[PDB]
Design a protein around this ligand. Structure first.
Ligand SMILES: Nc1ncnc2c1ncn2[C@@H]1O[C@H](COP(=O)(O)OP(=O)(O)NP(=O)(O)O)[C@@H](O)[C@H]1O
Ligand SMILES: Nc1ncnc2c1ncn2[C@@H]1O[C@H](COP(=O)(O)OP(=O)(O)O)[C@@H](O)[C@H]1O
Ligand SMILES: [Mg+2]
Ligand SMILES: [Mg+2]
Ligand SMILES: [Mg+2]
Length: 1285
């Protein structure tokens, strides 16, 4: 590769086989389905290096090297037709950006840009050009990639472009017509009253508006950016209204201002946290230390809906991503702590798993199917959360698509335009909650990555998390500076891009701002001022720093490799200006208010509509078929396929994840994180949502939302109900018949009543008002319309993280006491039973007693505190039957209950979705727990069901009449089928199957322990007592996300953790010659591009000074090096620097071809490892979270030798005890369960699971009842102390 390409040279570098066997097999499988006679097919990755200069031999080889990664699969000689798949031209992909990073960090400056593509070699050769476009169509994403017929054809990808000039709308010379033409041309979606405004304003000035100015205006004054509906004057049925929607939401903050530090004036809301030890690396000493101070909790939840319907992955990625910017940009700087995903789609209709209630209603040719969204969507947001470094600990997933007779007659009600929810929490320093003032002359910086044109087709987003991580560390570095925090005011970049972000900043500071277009970083020179000021690129932040703090900010950013650029100054005169240094002119100039200009307030004059709706027909319904159907509804069925694709262990403060009990059943009601690594205080996240009800009663749906949120979060020690702060996210189809009035009534219901009545606040929200899709099916039009979808996300301050409860039942003497808040209304309308039978029902569940709901909370709070309960699980989708079934799955046992005291309607008793739940109290405690519940007038609601027994019998009785009797393992399996099925079409079929097939063996003993040592014996204490703290280099490369907890572990082990960034070595600041203990940390170094750990390791291996530095470290006679996750792969590529590491394997893509976030069970095997000393023979579970941890040997003899030399320290074992290679007891698929090896002298030990994330007992998903503060994994670190003398 060296063919003529502009002022550059493009080089073609052949790579490794792309599609991993089973995929190719599925490819041809799908080819036959379209009558395409495709015999064989071979995918091969091919790299393209755009060079500005030349590479000498040594450099030419160093490049070919960086480009050898992935699984060592067998190579095929090209045969048949070639079909190259590259990203669409005029687009730079995340792979490219991250991959190109690596090149530069390796001294290859000649490498201008690296881009990758897949080269398909197909053998069918008997198809018409027609049949070929089809073959092509099956090989790329029409929304992101494009096919080429020649490898050389990829030159079009690196075509340089000239900066396009700014154009101007001729108002003065053409009249108002010009505003009309430009309105359609540029598609500004401007209303009459607004074109009027612009018309006048520009005549007052006396010059033509510049397309850029006009577009910026369009953005700043759009329904989304101004939230016009939510601030309109209302008129319901001829009677005008008093408050708007927002004012009614604002009501909850006027009535319950308690614990709120910031609300309705930032990117998020902030409430009071607790007095914990904030751990971070000191700025001067470069040493992690605990800072005993208040750590406050901020919360936010956003909705990236439409862009998700177009291109799912980008949709969800930039969903979590946007929310994370808000969090980070909250106040004067904060740190995201955890997060919650959420989805709402139409019927899946999984091929060969077509459910009884599913009926194809067609869909717009221009969007993607519900199943597609549910395959690519989850992977996108998960991709971002994982790369970035925040655990996704709770959420929801709902499907609904039915031809239901609702409020506007009979229509199609679903989610063809999906709800893509992404929100979470964070911790903010006390003295930072408030934005500082922007002093005149403040440097207006843009912290983030180079812009590209992103905001038809322009709904296809881009995601580069590793860029946001870098930015996050820069935020961090800043708030960590205590009072020296340079960020006077930070804000996030989102819609409208900078053309809204920057003005918005200077305005929230009562300033103006003169900017310079050519100072802004951009990866596409060809852009126009409009395109550079209004492009909605990702991973960007805006902030203002005092001029004399610029040196510090620069040095901080550089060290983190997070780019930034000063683009303007703060002016005293309210006035925005954009100077172009290339076209020597000024694209923007106008008084600030001219933009923030207003016309009439919206006024919606609507009418009410209440669905008549007929009572549920019971012809096909039978208790038995009901149970079988419900357990098959996506909204109810096990969600393993959304839980495990996203990390739930990072930060090492995950006290309560989705997985519950020894059997890891994903039935956790809320998520609980510890506020610090040295405390038992924390935060709690729950999610309330019941959108179908809105198709029968708008107020009910809204109320039930707050209800479930509460019932889901109740089994957590919080105290005063006023500690819970709600975020209301409103999804609706404004304009659709009656939905409008229904919205107002529902908002009134929670805003002006339910919430204020309980003591609940709503400091954060967001609103989507177009949840309906219109398209052409036949010669007639079809419309899919969403119900009033309110999604309440609850956030609270946990008092004692140790007292949280889960659904895991106990076999000891017990009582299953039902707390029916429905007061026996047992409604069946708008339920899972109804949906599953293609109906809407008669009357839906509703919050019956406002006082009892709080009574329920106070009651539960009392018990949680007193430790009277053994288990908890609220009632929602699928009612009591599903709540009891799950508790039986979670506890892997049986239930013997009786539902006679619940009424004759046994169907309604088991499937009523009324508020409430089931508590499992010890037997000897029944009376007292019943008496307490009585004190809160709840005595009328409580009913005794029965007990939980050891077994497989799930029996529900009614006196002496067996209402339903089945095997708990049979149900446990049906419920899982939905997730089993998704995994099949997404992950490796073999794995999806093995995981599902193992759920069938009732003899699964679940996670169980064995301890070769005393996990409570602190063999470090003697050294800690001398006060001498050995220094340990806690190594991190750009992209790493663990480190903080890793330091906290060595720290507890008596060490003195130091923050050492790779830049710290390459820049010369720090030297390894001073450390005796090194540690490569986990994360997504360079986003894993060019291979996980690869770019990180090769960045060392290439630079001679740093190379030497490291080798001289391992060779020294007194060192110790550790390498958890990511940092395990990094070191494994430094075999050439580490003594005693010849037999070491290479870590590659997991067999399942999917990231695995699991709590897997390992066995400590014999090995030289000094880090694992005295733990040999032990068996405890560990935090497994990686997508490239599979061991790979050259051949049998290699593994044969590796085993034989005994370099294996950790192996996976099934819950029985034997070493297994079966999924997912052995997640990655490593031979003989290997996930850790060592050196011959045991001084260096690399592994894959995270011993750091679980050094605290409370951070283990499940763990034996009697464990202390420390977990068995703490030992590793204490070993490093001892060992180091
Ligand atoms: N309908 C609403 N109900 C409650 N709070 C709201 C609502 N709309 C907005 N807010 C809050 O008021 C503030 C600003 O609205 P906003 O349009 O959300 O900018 P943003 O969320 O900070 N950043 P971005 O998502 O990039 O536009 C935020 O703190 C919101 O959480
Ligand atoms: N989209 C999602 N992403 C991650 N976890 C999810 C998602 N949807 C549901 N979950 C998790 O699945 C579990 C069960 O979901 P669900 O039955 O809706 O819970 P609940 O009954 O509490 O409403 C919970 O632990 C929840 O956090
Ligand atoms: Mg739910
Ligand atoms: Mg629940
Ligand atoms: Mg549920």
């Amino acid at each position: 590769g060296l063919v003529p390409r502009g002022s550059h040279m493009m080089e073609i570098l052949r790579g490794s086989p792309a599609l991993s066997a089973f995929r190719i097999n599925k490819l041809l499988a799908r080819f036959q389905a379209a009558n395409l006679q495709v015999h064989n097919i071979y995918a091969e990755y091919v790299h393209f290096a755009d060079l500005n200069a030349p590479l000498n031999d040594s450099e030419q080889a160093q490049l070919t090297r960086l480009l050898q990664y992935g699984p060592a699969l067998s190579s095929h000689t090209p045969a048949g037709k070639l079909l190259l798949v590259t990203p669409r031209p005029g687009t730079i992909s995340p792979w490219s950006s991250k991959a190109t990073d690596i090149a530069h960090n390796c001294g290859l400056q000649q490498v201008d840009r690296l881009e990758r593509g897949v080269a398909y070699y197909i053998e069918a050769s008997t198809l018409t050009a027609e049949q070929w476009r089809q073959v092509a169509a099956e090989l790329h994403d029409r929304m992101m990639e494009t096919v080429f017929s020649s490898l050389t054809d990829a030159e079009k990808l690196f075509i340089h472009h000239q900066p396009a000039p700014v154009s101007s709308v001729d108002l003065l010379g053409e009249g108002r017509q010009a505003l009309i033409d430009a309105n359609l041309r540029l598609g500004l979606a401007l209303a009459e009253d607004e074109i009027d405004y612009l018309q006048e304003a520009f005549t007052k000035l006396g010059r033509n508006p510049n397309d850029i100015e006009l577009y910026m205006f369009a953005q700043a004054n759009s329904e989304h950016c101004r939230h016009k509906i939510f601030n309109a004057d209302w008129i319901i049925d001829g009677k005008p209204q008093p408050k708007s929607l927002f004012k009614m939401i604002k009501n909850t903050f006027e009535t319950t201002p308690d614990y709120v530090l910031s609300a309705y004036k930032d990117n998020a809301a902030v409430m009071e946290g607790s007095a914990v030890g904030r751990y971070f690396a000191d700025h001067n000493t470069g040493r992690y230390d605990f800072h005993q101070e208040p750590a406050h909790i901020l919360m936010k939840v956003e909705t990236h809906n439409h862009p998700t319907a177009i291109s799912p992955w980008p949709g969800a990625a930039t969903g979590s991503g946007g929310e994370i910017r808000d969090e980070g940009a909250t106040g004067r700087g904060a740190k995201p702590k955890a997060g919650l995903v959420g989805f709402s789609v139409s019927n899946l209709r999984i091929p060969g798993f077509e459910q009884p209630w599913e009926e194809d209603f067609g869909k717009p040719e221009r969007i993607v199917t519900a199943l597609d969204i549910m395959t690519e969507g989850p992977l996108g947001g998960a991709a971002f959360n994982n790369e970035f470094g925040r655990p996704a600990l709770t959420g929801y997933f709902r499907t609904y698509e039915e031809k239901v007779n609702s409020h506007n007659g009979e229509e199609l009600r679903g989610y063809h335009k999906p709800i893509m929810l992404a929100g979470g929490i964070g911790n903010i320093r006390a003295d930072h909650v408030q934005k500082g003032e922007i002093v005149v002359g403040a440097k207006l910086i843009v912290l983030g990555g180079p812009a590209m044109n992103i905001g038809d087709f322009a709904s296809v987003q881009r995601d580069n998390p590793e860029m946001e991580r870098r930015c996050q560390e820069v935020i961090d570095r800043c708030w960590q500076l205590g009072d020296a925090n340079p960020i006077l005011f930070i804000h996030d970049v989102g819609a409208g891009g900078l053309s809204n972000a920057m003005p918005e900043l200077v305005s929230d500071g009562g300033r103006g701002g003169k900017f310079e277009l050519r100072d802004i970083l951009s990866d596409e020179p060809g852009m126009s001022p409009l395109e550079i000021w209004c492009n909605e690129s990702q991973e960007r932040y805006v902030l203002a720093v005092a001029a004399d703090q610029l040196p510090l900010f620069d040095e901080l950013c550089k060290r983190e490799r997070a780019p930034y650029a000063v683009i303007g100054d703060a002016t005293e005169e309210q006035h925005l200006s954009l100077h172009d240094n290339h076209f020597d002119n000024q694209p923007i100039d106008l008084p600030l208010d001219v933009l923030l200009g207003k016309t009439p307030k919206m006024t919606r004059d609507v009418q009410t509509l209440k669905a008549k709706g007929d009572a549920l027909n019971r012809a096909d319904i039978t208790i038995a078929d009901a149970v079988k159907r419900v357990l098959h509804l996506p909204t109810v069925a096990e969600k393993t396929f959304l839980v495990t694709i996203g990390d739930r262990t990072v930060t090492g403060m995950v006290a309560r994840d989705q997985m519950v009990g020894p059997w890891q059943v994903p039935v956790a009601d809320c998520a609980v994180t510890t506020a610090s690594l040295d405390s038992y205080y924390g935060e709690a996240m729950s999610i309330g949502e019941r959108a179908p009800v809105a198709l029968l009663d708008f107020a009910a749906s809204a109320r039930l939302a707050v209800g479930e949120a509460l019932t889901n979060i109740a089994a957590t020690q919080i105290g005063d109900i006023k500690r819970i702060k709600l975020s209301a996210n409103w999804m609706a189809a404004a304009g659709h018949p009656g939905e409008d009035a229904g919205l107002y009534d529902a908002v009134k219901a929670v805003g002006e009543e339910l919430c204020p009545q309980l003591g609940l606040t709503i400091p954060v929200g967001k609103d989507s008002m177009s949840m309906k899709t219109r398209w052409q099916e036949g010669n007639e039009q079809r419309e899919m319309t969403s119900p009033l979808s309110l999604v309440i996300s609850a956030f609270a301050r946990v008092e004692d993280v140790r007292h949280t409860l889960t659904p895991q039942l106990s076999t000891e003497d017990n009582a299953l006491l039902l707390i029916d808040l429905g007061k026996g209304h047992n409604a069946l309308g708008a339920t899972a039973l109804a949906q599953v039978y293609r109906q809407l029902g008669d009357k839906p569940a509703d919050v019956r007693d406002v006082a009892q709901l709080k009574g329920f909370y106070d009651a539960m709070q009392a018990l949680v505190a007193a430790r009277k309960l053994l288990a908890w699980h609220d009632r929602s989708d699928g009612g009591l039957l599903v709540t009891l079934a799950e508790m039986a799955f979670a506890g892997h046992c049986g239930v013997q209950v009786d539902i006679a005291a619940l009424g004759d309607d046994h169907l309604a008793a088991l499937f009523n979705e009324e508020l409430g739940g089931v508590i499992q109290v010890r037997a000897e405690d029944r009376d007292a727990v019943e008496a307490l519940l009585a004190q809160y007038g709840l005595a009328d609601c409580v009913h005794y069901l029965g007990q939980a027994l050891a077994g497989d019998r799930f029996v529900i009785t009614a006196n002496d009449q067996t209402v339903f009797s089945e095997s708990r393992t049979t149900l446990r399996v049906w419920w899982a089928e939905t997730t089993w099925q998704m995994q099949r079409l997404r992950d490796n079929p073999q794995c999806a199957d093995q995981e599902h097939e193992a759920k069938a063996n009732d003899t699964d003993p679940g996670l169980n322990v064995k301890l070769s040592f005393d996990i409570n014996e602190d063999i470090a204490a003697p050294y800690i007592a001398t006060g001498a703290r050995p220094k340990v280099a806690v190594l991190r490369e750009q992209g790493v996300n663990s480190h903080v907890e890793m330091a906290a572990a060595f720290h507890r082990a008596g060490f003195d953790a130091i923050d050492v960034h790779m830049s710290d070595l390459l820049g010369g600041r720090i030297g390894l010659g001073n450390f005796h203990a090194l540690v490569a940390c986990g994360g997504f170094s360079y986003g894993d591009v060019l291979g996980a750990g690869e770019g990180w390791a090769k960045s060392i291996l290439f630079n001679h000074r740093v190379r030497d530095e490291f080798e001289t470290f391992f060779h020294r006679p007194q060192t110790l090096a550790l390498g958890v996750c990511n940092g395990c792969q990094m070191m494994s590529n430094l075999r050439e620097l580490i003594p005693g590491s010849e037999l070491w394997p290479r870590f590659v893509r997991n067999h399942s071809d999917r990231f695995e976030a699991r709590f897997s069970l390992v066995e400590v095997t014999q090995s030289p490892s000094l880090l694992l000393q005295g733990m040999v023979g032990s068996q405890m579970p560990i935090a497994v979270s990686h997508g490239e941890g599979r061991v790979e040997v050259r051949d049998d003899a290699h593994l044969a030798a590796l085993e034989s030399k005994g370099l294996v320290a950790l192996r996976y074992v099934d819950n029985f005890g034997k070493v297994t290679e079966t999924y997912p007891a052995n997640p990655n698929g490593s031979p003989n369960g290997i996930t850790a090896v060592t050196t011959e002298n045991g001084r260096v030990t690399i592994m894959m699971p995270h011993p750091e994330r679980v050094f605290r007992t409370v951070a283990n998903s499940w763990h034996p009842e009697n464990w202390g503060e420390d977990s068995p994994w703490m030992r590793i670190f204490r070993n490093a102390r001892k060992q180091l003398g």
